[PDB]
């Protein structure tokens, strides 16, 4: 058009329509006087060869041809139809799955309780009980409250108002209401009081956590009884009371000063349990008024990160299928040495930022609070005392009469009751008050909630007079096991940055502060009954990015139903036993097509059917996976590979797993899998890297690798050393110079020209430095401190008289000088030793098969050298690790090439050539 080019909507850029001398001038003055923003530059979209003009759907929905179901799986068959002059990117495809989910009775997406949270945890509800008479003869005792002040009390109840001349009485079904009482702080004469009380027939439960559903629209909870005529009727019964002194009188003066509305209710404790059960005897009693409640542990339950586990991968028995209708041959070739899920995890990390959540794919990385993993104990800022005061601001007082002086005398005084009251309330001295250390309490609560309750089960004990399951994998067991707060109190490693030794080997991601798991639990909702509707992506490396040319194709895949696989819980309890169930109602397949111009689509199809233009992909992980059993408490882990070809071997990577948290894939269903926590093998939530000591690599036999006198200790890879006489540790921890150098080179190629912090983009979530956490602390020297004394938790007393004894129960004992912990600071500091260690979560240990350990090219220089390229070699690796009281696994990834070439010669045909070297099929 004419005016567009003039107004620079269209036309040429500023560099082209301006004076050449001015453009030259602008380039010269750019650095100190830019003129770019002064002149418009047009941007024009192409008008032809891009988009079609005929009617064309952007999204196709395919309902499955055939669906089969077992108890633990279900396979769906789709006929993916790519029409002519249409082009489909498999990245734009996903399965739309809908069903009903039941997370079960162990799902608790919150801490604390929903009911009477502010109530003191030992305070009972207004209750009654039968008790031995003793002056069988029994009598009923009442313990209650009467907050409502009424007009009068007759046999018709408490008078709550008047309707002209008629007195109005409380509707027993909901009046008086328990949340109503006096509106002023100071005392008043209440000659006609009323309240509600629970009958002796209703079990005794502490107020904290008490819930009784309502039986009427006005909030009444009185259980209704079905009468003969078939109508429901209230069983609320009135109980009148007067003072014992008043009942001593003859009787004519006898009148009730209190009326309690006694009722039965369906009490329950949905989200709390009993922390102190005084007696095993069942039935209401005065003793049972002392039982204390405690909120049930939080247990978030959701679908896994990136919907890990929903789709079968790397399972020969349940292999996905993509094929052309014509050719019966399948394009998918899956192996059990492949790890598709973990590959997708690390791939996603390499591409983008895993800290960001994307609801569609359940893309929310598993994580843990850093201040929970490593405790950084600064103590508390409690310099100022904190006080609570009387609601009146004064407290108890005495009554005083005013007096006035005899103004003509030295010290004469006279009563003055004419103008002033003789009962004036005055308190002499400071007001009444109580004291609390708020920050100390908050710190203590944090430690007990996030750390103490997660200690290994060997440090807990079974509650007294409370039934508990026999299965340690159940929520009931994890919830009722008692941990004493003194194990993780305010004074733990005070002033150190130090993770508890007992917690190092505990999966930090099985925690209620796992932000990712929590987000994925709340994406479903806050209830256990959840109708869900989700989108599941294709992760197999050969397909997920394939560009499918016209033709029809069978796309068939298998899916899991195992709650322990498809669901994830923060506590890891066995969701099979704990009542979780899932049902997949329907499934569809959605494919998004570029509305490509038909001439362009045909030309591109033609170009892509040629041999030279076969599409090629490879697994990001690019490794063959091997798991070697490490029996309990074993430190030496020997493994050997028979003589074979190593051409293109890229290197080793390894970490350590727990057999409990690692399911046996390929079987289709693991009957011995009793765990619903994170699965590091799949999601990359590794956390046992610190338990490695050293690795010995021996090619063939007697040939050490890398040898050549390279390392400070050349025969073996020394990861960490306990007290190095040589002084080969680094970075103020127990890691070796050799190992640190190797890892820095493997991850960033830094070692040889100085050590520094890698660039952020190079140091990602699963990188080494990002997760490298060295730590040190001091501890009493039991040999050199002459006054040492071993005082277990049973006889430690710090904050005695203000905390519970060995339980999260109530205040107990007396004030007394502490006997624990030993002071490591100040004039009286004890002789101390120093312990160094480190943590390295999420990352993998890397030994690249490179001459200088660097990354100069995927195909390592050693992967090409003559020795390993034109000969066969057997391998013998020996890992020395820290002992652990349960079976573990050595996870070794043999870094190789895992490539696939994909050829589409004709419409509806698809051929694939798979190669993985070293370690071929």
């Amino acid at each position, epitope marked *: 058009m004419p005016q567009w080019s003039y107004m620079h909507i269209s036309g040429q850029d500023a560099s082209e329509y301006l004076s050449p001398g001015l453009v030259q001038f602008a380039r010269a003055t750019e650095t100190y006087f830019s003129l770019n923003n002064k002149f418009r530059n047009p941007t024009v979209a192409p008008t032809h060869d891009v988009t079609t003009d005929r009617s064309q759907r952007l999204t196709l929905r395919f309902i499955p041809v055939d669906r089969e179901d077992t108890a633990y799986s279900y396979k769906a068959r789709f006929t993916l139809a790519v029409g002519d002059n249409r082009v489909l990117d498999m990245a734009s495809t996903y399965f739309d799955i809908r069903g009903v989910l039941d997370r079960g009775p162990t799902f608790k997406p919150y801490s604390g309780t929903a009911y009477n949270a502010l109530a003191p945890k030992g305070a009972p509800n207004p209750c009654e009980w039968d008790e031995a008479a003793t002056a069988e003869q029994q009598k009923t005792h009442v313990f209650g409250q009467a907050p409502y002040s009424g007009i009068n009390i007759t046999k018709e109840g408490i008078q709550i108002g008047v309707e002209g001349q008629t007195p109005k009485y409380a509707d027993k079904t909901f009046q008086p209401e328990p949340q109503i009482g006096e509106s002023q702080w100071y005392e008043t004469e209440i000659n006609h009081a009323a309240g509600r009380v629970l009958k002796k027939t209703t079990p005794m439960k502490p107020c904290y956590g008490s819930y009784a559903k309502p039986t009427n629209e006005n909030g009444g909870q009185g259980i209704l009884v079905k009468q003969q005529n078939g109508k429901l009727e209230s069983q609320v019964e009135m109980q009148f009371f007067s003072t014992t002194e008043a009942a001593a009188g003859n009787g004519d003066n006898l009148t009730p000063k209190v009326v309690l509305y006694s009722e039965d209710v369906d009490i329950e404790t949905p989200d709390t349990h009993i922390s102190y059960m005084p007696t095993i005897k069942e039935g209401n009693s005065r003793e049972l008024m002392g039982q204390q409640s405690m909120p049930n542990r939080p247990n978030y339950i959701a679908f896994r990160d990136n919907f890990i586990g929903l789709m079968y991968y790397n399972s020969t028995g349940n292999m996905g299928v993509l094929a052309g209708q014509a050719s019966q041959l399948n394009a998918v070739v899956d192996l059990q040495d492949r790890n598709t899920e973990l590959s997708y995890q690390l791939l996603l990390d390499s591409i983008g930022d895993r800290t960001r959540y994307f609801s569609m794919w359940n893309q929310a990385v598993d994580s843990y609070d850093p201040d929970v993993r490593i405790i950084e104990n600064h103590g508390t800022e409690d310099e100022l005392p904190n006080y609570c005061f009387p609601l009146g601001g004064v407290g108890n007082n005495s009554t005083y009469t005013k007096v006035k002086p*005899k*103004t*003509g*005398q*030295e*010290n*004469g005084w*006279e009563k003055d009751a004419t103008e002033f009251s003789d009962k004036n309330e005055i308190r002499v001295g400071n007001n009444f008050a109580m004291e609390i250390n708020l920050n100390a309490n908050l710190w203590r609560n944090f430690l007990y909630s996030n750390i103490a309750l997660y200690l290994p089960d060997k440090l807990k004990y079974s509650p007294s007079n409370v039934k508990i399951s026999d299965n340690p994998n159940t929520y009931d067991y994890m919830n009722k096991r008692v941990v004493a707060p003194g194990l993780v109190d305010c004074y733990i490693n005070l002033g150190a940055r130090w993770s508890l030794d007992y917690m190092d080997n505990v999966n930090p991601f099985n925690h209620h502060r796992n932000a990712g798991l929590r987000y994925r639990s709340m994406l479903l909702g806050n209830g256990r009954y959840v109708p869900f509707h989700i989108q599941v992506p294709q992760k197999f490396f050969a397909i997920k990015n394939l560009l499918l040319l016209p033709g029809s194709y069978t796309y068939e895949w298998n899916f899991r139903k195992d709650v322990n696989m498809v669901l994830q819980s923060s506590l890891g309890n066995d969701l099979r036993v704990d009542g979780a169930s899932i049902k997949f109602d329907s499934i569809c397949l959605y494919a998004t097509f570029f509305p490509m111009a038909h001439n362009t689509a045909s030309t591109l199809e033609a170009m892509l059917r040629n041999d030279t233009n076969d599409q090629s992909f490879n697994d990001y992980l690019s490794a063959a996976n091997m798991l070697y059993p490490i029996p309990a408490n074993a430190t030496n882990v020997p493994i050997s590979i028979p003589s074979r070809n190593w051409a293109a071997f890229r290197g080793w990577a390894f970490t350590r797993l727990k057999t409990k948290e690692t399911p046996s894939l390929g079987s289709g269903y693991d009957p011995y899998y009793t765990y619903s926590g994170s699965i590091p093998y799949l999601d990359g939530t590794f956390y046992l890297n610190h338990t490695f000591k050293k690795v010995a690599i021996t090619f063939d036999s007697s040939v050490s690798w890398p040898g050549n006198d390279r390392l400070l200790t050349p025969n073996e890879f020394e990861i960490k050393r306990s007290v190095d006489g040589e002084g080969y540790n680094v970075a103020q921890c127990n890691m070796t110079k050799d190992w640190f150098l190797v890892q820095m080179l493997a991850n960033y190629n830094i070692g040889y020209q100085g050590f520094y912090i890698p660039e952020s983009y190079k140091d990602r979530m699963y990188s080494f430095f990002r997760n490298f956490q060295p730590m040190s602390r001091q501890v009493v020297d039991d040999t050199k401190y002459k006054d040492y004394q071993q005082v277990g938790i049973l006889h430690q007393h710090n904050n005695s008289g203000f905390v519970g004894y060995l339980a999260p129960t109530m205040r107990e004992g007396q004030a007394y000088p502490a006997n624990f912990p030993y002071p490591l600071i100040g004039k009286t500091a004890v002789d101390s030793i120093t312990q160094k260690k480190f943590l390295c979560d999420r990352t993998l240990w890397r030994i690249p098969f490179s001459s200088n350990f660097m990354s100069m090219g995927a195909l390592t220089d050693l992967g090409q050298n003559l020795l390993y390229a034109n000969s066969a070699h057997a391998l013998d690796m020996t890992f020395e690790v820290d002992p652990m009281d349960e079976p573990t696994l050595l996870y070794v990834l043999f870094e190789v090439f895992d490539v696939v070439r994909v050829h589409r010669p004709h419409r509806g045909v698809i051929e694939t050539v798979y190669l993985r070297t070293p370690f071929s099929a």
Partner: single-chain antibody
Amino acid sequence: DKDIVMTQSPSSLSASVGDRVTITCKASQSVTNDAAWYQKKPGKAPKLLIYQASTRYTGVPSRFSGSGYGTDFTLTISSLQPEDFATYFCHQDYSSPLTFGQGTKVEIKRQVQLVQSGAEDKKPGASVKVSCKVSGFSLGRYGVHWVRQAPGQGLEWMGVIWRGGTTDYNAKFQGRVTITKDDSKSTVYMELSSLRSEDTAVYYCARQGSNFPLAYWGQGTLVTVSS
């Protein structure tokens, strides 16, 4: 907050040794039981006889007795004796200003120490400053009052300086009186201004007890004023 007038009846009396004498006092308002009777002879200073209506001060013969409460009080001598011929005064310290009665005249029919400065005299319109040296007690424990007796008149309470230094003056003097004290020198000063010929009087330094009225007096200082 309004002067309490002690009305003493009769005015004068004639008596013989052995007779019984009775004097009465009517206050403008109740003083509970804060009535006291004093005996004064021309030369000497007042002597406390009865206080709190019915209580006999220390070293007072048995023949003296007091009675009454509120507004009415009575002082009776059961049997007169030549040493008792003097002029007796009603008194109240329930309220400030302290007030005495007009004083009755008994005529015939046929340790703690306060020392004042010397007497003096001056012309109208001028001022005086009188001293009162104290011994036997601390001025931080007691306040010192100033009273005066004008010829042919009763007893006039002038003011007081209390233990804490707080002064209280008789409004009748229109702020002419100013009382000060030096604790170091243990002396009390009373300064009167704008003298008039009617201020010709004896001026007495005085001190009360912890729980009984004025009981310790100075020697008296005669101030004369004439044109």
